[PDB]
mmCIF file of all heavy atoms in Angstrom:
data_model
loop_
_atom_site.group_PDB
_atom_site.id
_atom_site.type_symbol
_atom_site.label_atom_id
_atom_site.label_comp_id
_atom_site.label_asym_id
_atom_site.label_seq_id
_atom_site.Cartn_x
_atom_site.Cartn_y
_atom_site.Cartn_z
ATOM 1 N N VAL O 452 -23.360 31.007 59.412
ATOM 2 C CA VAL O 452 -23.744 31.773 58.233
ATOM 3 C C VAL O 452 -22.606 32.695 57.812
ATOM 4 O O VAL O 452 -22.259 32.788 56.628
ATOM 5 C CB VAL O 452 -25.039 32.552 58.520
ATOM 6 C CG1 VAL O 452 -25.408 33.433 57.369
ATOM 7 C CG2 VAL O 452 -26.180 31.583 58.809
ATOM 8 N N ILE O 453 -22.006 33.392 58.778
ATOM 9 C CA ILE O 453 -20.887 34.275 58.455
ATOM 10 C C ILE O 453 -19.706 33.464 57.931
ATOM 11 O O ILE O 453 -19.019 33.867 56.981
ATOM 12 C CB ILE O 453 -20.498 35.124 59.679
ATOM 13 C CG1 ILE O 453 -21.635 36.076 60.051
ATOM 14 C CG2 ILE O 453 -19.240 35.920 59.390
ATOM 15 C CD1 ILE O 453 -21.552 36.607 61.467
ATOM 16 N N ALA O 454 -19.454 32.303 58.538
ATOM 17 C CA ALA O 454 -18.373 31.441 58.077
ATOM 18 C C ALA O 454 -18.619 30.965 56.653
ATOM 19 O O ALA O 454 -17.690 30.896 55.846
ATOM 20 C CB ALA O 454 -18.220 30.249 59.017
ATOM 21 N N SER O 455 -19.863 30.611 56.333
ATOM 22 C CA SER O 455 -20.192 30.205 54.974
ATOM 23 C C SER O 455 -20.003 31.353 53.998
ATOM 24 O O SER O 455 -19.527 31.145 52.876
ATOM 25 C CB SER O 455 -21.629 29.693 54.920
ATOM 26 O OG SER O 455 -21.911 29.103 53.666
ATOM 27 N N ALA O 456 -20.374 32.567 54.401
ATOM 28 C CA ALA O 456 -20.135 33.721 53.546
ATOM 29 C C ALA O 456 -18.649 33.884 53.266
ATOM 30 O O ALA O 456 -18.252 34.171 52.131
ATOM 31 C CB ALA O 456 -20.701 34.982 54.194
ATOM 32 N N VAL O 457 -17.815 33.702 54.287
ATOM 33 C CA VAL O 457 -16.371 33.787 54.079
ATOM 34 C C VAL O 457 -15.899 32.676 53.149
ATOM 35 O O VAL O 457 -15.110 32.910 52.227
ATOM 36 C CB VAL O 457 -15.634 33.744 55.428
ATOM 37 C CG1 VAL O 457 -14.140 33.595 55.209
ATOM 38 C CG2 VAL O 457 -15.933 34.992 56.234
ATOM 39 N N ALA O 458 -16.377 31.451 53.373
ATOM 40 C CA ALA O 458 -15.862 30.303 52.632
ATOM 41 C C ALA O 458 -16.275 30.354 51.168
ATOM 42 O O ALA O 458 -15.578 29.812 50.297
ATOM 43 C CB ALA O 458 -16.349 29.008 53.278
ATOM 44 N N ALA O 459 -17.419 30.975 50.885
ATOM 45 C CA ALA O 459 -17.860 31.099 49.505
ATOM 46 C C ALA O 459 -16.800 31.783 48.660
ATOM 47 O O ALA O 459 -16.669 31.498 47.468
ATOM 48 C CB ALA O 459 -19.176 31.869 49.439
ATOM 49 N N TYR O 460 -16.015 32.677 49.264
ATOM 50 C CA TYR O 460 -14.976 33.367 48.508
ATOM 51 C C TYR O 460 -13.973 32.384 47.927
ATOM 52 O O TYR O 460 -13.680 32.413 46.727
ATOM 53 C CB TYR O 460 -14.257 34.380 49.395
ATOM 54 C CG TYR O 460 -12.986 34.900 48.767
ATOM 55 C CD1 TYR O 460 -13.012 35.982 47.903
ATOM 56 C CD2 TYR O 460 -11.766 34.298 49.021
ATOM 57 C CE1 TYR O 460 -11.863 36.457 47.321
ATOM 58 C CE2 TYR O 460 -10.610 34.765 48.441
ATOM 59 C CZ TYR O 460 -10.664 35.847 47.592
ATOM 60 O OH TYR O 460 -9.516 36.322 47.008
ATOM 61 N N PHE O 461 -13.419 31.512 48.769
ATOM 62 C CA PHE O 461 -12.387 30.614 48.275
ATOM 63 C C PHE O 461 -12.988 29.464 47.481
ATOM 64 O O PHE O 461 -12.288 28.849 46.671
ATOM 65 C CB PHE O 461 -11.516 30.112 49.431
ATOM 66 C CG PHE O 461 -12.144 29.037 50.272
ATOM 67 C CD1 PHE O 461 -12.197 27.731 49.828
ATOM 68 C CD2 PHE O 461 -12.636 29.325 51.529
ATOM 69 C CE1 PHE O 461 -12.754 26.743 50.601
ATOM 70 C CE2 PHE O 461 -13.194 28.336 52.308
ATOM 71 C CZ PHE O 461 -13.253 27.045 51.843
ATOM 72 N N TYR O 462 -14.270 29.157 47.688
ATOM 73 C CA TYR O 462 -14.929 28.205 46.796
ATOM 74 C C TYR O 462 -15.127 28.811 45.414
ATOM 75 O O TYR O 462 -15.085 28.107 44.400
ATOM 76 C CB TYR O 462 -16.266 27.761 47.382
ATOM 77 C CG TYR O 462 -16.138 26.862 48.583
ATOM 78 C CD1 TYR O 462 -16.773 27.170 49.773
ATOM 79 C CD2 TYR O 462 -15.390 25.698 48.524
ATOM 80 C CE1 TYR O 462 -16.662 26.350 50.871
ATOM 81 C CE2 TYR O 462 -15.273 24.873 49.616
ATOM 82 C CZ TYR O 462 -15.910 25.204 50.787
ATOM 83 O OH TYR O 462 -15.799 24.385 51.885
ATOM 84 N N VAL O 463 -15.343 30.124 45.359
ATOM 85 C CA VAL O 463 -15.663 30.788 44.102
ATOM 86 C C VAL O 463 -14.394 31.123 43.333
ATOM 87 O O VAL O 463 -14.408 31.228 42.102
ATOM 88 C CB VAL O 463 -16.503 32.045 44.387
ATOM 89 C CG1 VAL O 463 -16.446 33.004 43.220
ATOM 90 C CG2 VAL O 463 -17.933 31.655 44.703
ATOM 91 N N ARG O 464 -13.289 31.341 44.046
ATOM 92 C CA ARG O 464 -12.034 31.660 43.375
ATOM 93 C C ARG O 464 -11.639 30.548 42.411
ATOM 94 O O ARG O 464 -11.067 30.802 41.342
ATOM 95 C CB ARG O 464 -10.932 31.893 44.407
ATOM 96 C CG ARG O 464 -9.581 32.246 43.802
ATOM 97 C CD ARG O 464 -8.477 32.229 44.843
ATOM 98 N NE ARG O 464 -8.461 33.420 45.683
ATOM 99 C CZ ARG O 464 -7.715 33.553 46.771
ATOM 100 N NH1 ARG O 464 -6.956 32.566 47.215
ATOM 101 N NH2 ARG O 464 -7.726 34.709 47.428
ATOM 102 N N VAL O 465 -11.931 29.299 42.776
ATOM 103 C CA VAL O 465 -11.605 28.183 41.897
ATOM 104 C C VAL O 465 -12.396 28.280 40.604
ATOM 105 O O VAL O 465 -11.861 28.064 39.514
ATOM 106 C CB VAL O 465 -11.859 26.844 42.606
ATOM 107 C CG1 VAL O 465 -11.550 25.690 41.665
ATOM 108 C CG2 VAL O 465 -11.029 26.750 43.861
ATOM 109 N N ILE O 466 -13.686 28.594 40.704
ATOM 110 C CA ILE O 466 -14.493 28.752 39.501
ATOM 111 C C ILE O 466 -13.978 29.925 38.677
ATOM 112 O O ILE O 466 -13.956 29.872 37.440
ATOM 113 C CB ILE O 466 -15.974 28.917 39.878
ATOM 114 C CG1 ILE O 466 -16.459 27.700 40.673
ATOM 115 C CG2 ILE O 466 -16.813 29.103 38.636
ATOM 116 C CD1 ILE O 466 -17.835 27.876 41.291
ATOM 117 N N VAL O 467 -13.547 30.995 39.347
ATOM 118 C CA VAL O 467 -12.972 32.128 38.630
ATOM 119 C C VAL O 467 -11.789 31.676 37.794
ATOM 120 O O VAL O 467 -11.720 31.943 36.591
ATOM 121 C CB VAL O 467 -12.561 33.241 39.612
ATOM 122 C CG1 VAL O 467 -11.745 34.304 38.896
ATOM 123 C CG2 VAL O 467 -13.780 33.862 40.240
ATOM 124 N N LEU O 468 -10.855 30.958 38.410
ATOM 125 C CA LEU O 468 -9.677 30.510 37.676
ATOM 126 C C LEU O 468 -10.067 29.544 36.564
ATOM 127 O O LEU O 468 -9.552 29.618 35.445
ATOM 128 C CB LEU O 468 -8.684 29.864 38.638
ATOM 129 C CG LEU O 468 -7.918 30.852 39.515
ATOM 130 C CD1 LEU O 468 -7.561 30.188 40.819
ATOM 131 C CD2 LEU O 468 -6.667 31.361 38.818
ATOM 132 N N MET O 469 -10.996 28.636 36.856
ATOM 133 C CA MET O 469 -11.332 27.579 35.913
ATOM 134 C C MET O 469 -11.982 28.138 34.656
ATOM 135 O O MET O 469 -11.612 27.765 33.537
ATOM 136 C CB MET O 469 -12.251 26.569 36.593
ATOM 137 C CG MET O 469 -11.517 25.638 37.534
ATOM 138 S SD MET O 469 -12.616 24.678 38.584
ATOM 139 C CE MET O 469 -13.771 24.064 37.376
ATOM 140 N N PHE O 470 -12.951 29.035 34.814
ATOM 141 C CA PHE O 470 -13.758 29.489 33.689
ATOM 142 C C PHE O 470 -13.437 30.899 33.224
ATOM 143 O O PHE O 470 -13.384 31.145 32.019
ATOM 144 C CB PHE O 470 -15.242 29.416 34.050
ATOM 145 C CG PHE O 470 -15.817 28.037 33.955
ATOM 146 C CD1 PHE O 470 -16.121 27.322 35.095
ATOM 147 C CD2 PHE O 470 -16.054 27.456 32.725
ATOM 148 C CE1 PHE O 470 -16.651 26.054 35.012
ATOM 149 C CE2 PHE O 470 -16.585 26.189 32.635
ATOM 150 C CZ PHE O 470 -16.883 25.487 33.779
ATOM 151 N N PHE O 471 -13.232 31.837 34.143
ATOM 152 C CA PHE O 471 -13.113 33.240 33.776
ATOM 153 C C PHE O 471 -11.708 33.618 33.330
ATOM 154 O O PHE O 471 -11.530 34.671 32.709
ATOM 155 C CB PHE O 471 -13.526 34.123 34.956
ATOM 156 C CG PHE O 471 -14.851 33.746 35.570
ATOM 157 C CD1 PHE O 471 -15.173 34.165 36.847
ATOM 158 C CD2 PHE O 471 -15.770 32.976 34.878
ATOM 159 C CE1 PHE O 471 -16.375 33.820 37.422
ATOM 160 C CE2 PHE O 471 -16.978 32.633 35.448
ATOM 161 C CZ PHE O 471 -17.280 33.058 36.720
ATOM 162 N N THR O 472 -10.710 32.791 33.628
ATOM 163 C CA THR O 472 -9.331 33.075 33.259
ATOM 164 C C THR O 472 -8.929 32.255 32.040
ATOM 165 O O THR O 472 -9.429 31.149 31.829
ATOM 166 C CB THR O 472 -8.387 32.768 34.421
ATOM 167 O OG1 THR O 472 -8.887 33.371 35.620
ATOM 168 C CG2 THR O 472 -6.993 33.298 34.137
ATOM 169 N N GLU O 473 -8.026 32.809 31.237
ATOM 170 C CA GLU O 473 -7.533 32.088 30.078
ATOM 171 C C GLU O 473 -6.528 31.021 30.510
ATOM 172 O O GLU O 473 -5.791 31.209 31.481
ATOM 173 C CB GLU O 473 -6.878 33.047 29.090
ATOM 174 N N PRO O 474 -6.473 29.891 29.811
ATOM 175 C CA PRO O 474 -5.532 28.835 30.191
ATOM 176 C C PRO O 474 -4.098 29.320 30.086
ATOM 177 O O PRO O 474 -3.761 30.089 29.174
ATOM 178 C CB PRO O 474 -5.815 27.715 29.177
ATOM 179 C CG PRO O 474 -7.140 28.026 28.603
ATOM 180 C CD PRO O 474 -7.275 29.509 28.637
ATOM 181 N N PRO O 475 -3.221 28.899 30.994
ATOM 182 C CA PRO O 475 -1.801 29.226 30.846
ATOM 183 C C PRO O 475 -1.157 28.397 29.746
ATOM 184 O O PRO O 475 -1.736 27.447 29.218
ATOM 185 C CB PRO O 475 -1.210 28.891 32.218
ATOM 186 C CG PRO O 475 -2.120 27.863 32.775
ATOM 187 C CD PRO O 475 -3.490 28.191 32.257
ATOM 188 N N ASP O 476 0.073 28.783 29.399
ATOM 189 C CA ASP O 476 0.777 28.107 28.315
ATOM 190 C C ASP O 476 1.022 26.637 28.631
ATOM 191 O O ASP O 476 0.873 25.782 27.751
ATOM 192 C CB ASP O 476 2.102 28.815 28.034
ATOM 193 N N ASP O 477 1.396 26.324 29.872
ATOM 194 C CA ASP O 477 1.686 24.960 30.294
ATOM 195 C C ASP O 477 0.554 24.361 31.121
ATOM 196 O O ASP O 477 0.807 23.631 32.085
ATOM 197 C CB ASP O 477 2.993 24.920 31.084
#
């Protein structure tokens, strides 16, 4: 359970970059 809580962070960072961040120029 603790490991899953930790892993959720790096699983969620991808969604952050994909949706919450603006696309880069290239």
